[PDB]
Amino acid sequence: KWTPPRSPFNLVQEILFHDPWKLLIATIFLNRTSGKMAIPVLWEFLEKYPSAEVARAADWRDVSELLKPLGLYDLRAKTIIKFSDEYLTKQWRYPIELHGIGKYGNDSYRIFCVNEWKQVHPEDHKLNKYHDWLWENHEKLSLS
């Protein structure tokens, strides 16, 4: 029922919030990685591995090949595949309990996938831009 309003910042989380797995995957790709570089590869990955079910049964050697433009491709690939498996197999309340997810991914989740933005204090620049804007205009929008 919670629909995160569209901001003038077009965060990638705004396009993927409908699927928590995809939103969290995006945060994995964006973690410590430039958006200009990571986003293009992210769309490629999501095209070849469109779901957690697909990503979890995937071959890390193949995933890492697709992740070469971002460096550390072997580690990234294995993390993505492991997180995907835990996301679908582990019992969790918040994604931070899953492999590969930290504050950044959990804050993204808690602002975009569930309605807890008011309790979130982001440390990511773009998340802070969106969050500040949400606070600035939440009266005028209709929300929390």
UniProtKB/Swiss-Prot annotation:
Localization annotation: Nucleus
Disulfide bonds: none
Source species, domain of life: Eukaryota
Active-site residues annotated for this sequence: 124
Assembly notes: Interacts with MLH1.
Task performed by this protein: Mismatch-specific DNA N-glycosylase involved in DNA repair. Has thymine glycosylase activity and is specific for G:T mismatches within methylated and unmethylated CpG sites. Can also remove uracil or 5-fluorouracil in G:U mismatches. Has no lyase activity. Was first identified as methyl-CpG-binding protein.
Protein's name according to its UniProt entry: Methyl-CpG-binding domain protein 4
Shown part of the complete sequence: 411 to 554 of 554
